[PDB]
């Protein structure tokens, strides 16, 4: 089947977008060595929050007022 004209234009535009993405990824701000350890502190704190949530699972408090509140269903006007 013949390749449509509009189809060729569409893919050519997509090729240009991806080709430019090569350019912007060719200029690393920091080298490999300079990266090591720069974000260690933030990562460690994030994991600690994850651990705290996992080990905080436990049942909930129970109150006499909640259970005694059921008696209010029979409230009336004198």
């Amino acid at each position: 089947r013949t390749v449509s004209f509009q189809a060729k234009e569409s893919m050519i535009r997509r090729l240009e977008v991806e080709a430019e993405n090569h350019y912007w990824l060719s200029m690393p701000y920091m080298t490999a060595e300079q990266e090591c350890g720069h974000a260690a502190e933030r990562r460690a704190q994030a994991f600690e929050a994850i651990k705290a949530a996992a080990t905080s699972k436990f049942p909930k408090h129970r109150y006499i007022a909640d259970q005694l509140d059921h008696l209010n269903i029979s409230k009336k006007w004198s």
Binding site: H61, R62, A65
Partner: protein, 55 residues
């Protein structure tokens, strides 16, 4: 067999066990049943702790 204001007991236990663990213990207060629940086994520590108070 807790009696009175159970909430005061929870606060006292929380302070007592925090330094040993290094964190506030996870606890449940069952007001209807009058019980206090603590994660982990601290039977020996709490028994002596309750003994000192004279309960």
């Amino acid at each position: 067999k807790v009696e009175g204001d159970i909430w005061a007991l929870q606060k006292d236990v929380e302070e007592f066990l925090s330094p040993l663990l290094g964190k506030t213990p996870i606890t449940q207060v069952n007001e209807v049943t009058g019980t206090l629940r603590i994660k982990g086994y601290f039977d020996e520590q709490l028994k002596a702790w309750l003994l000192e108070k004279g309960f």
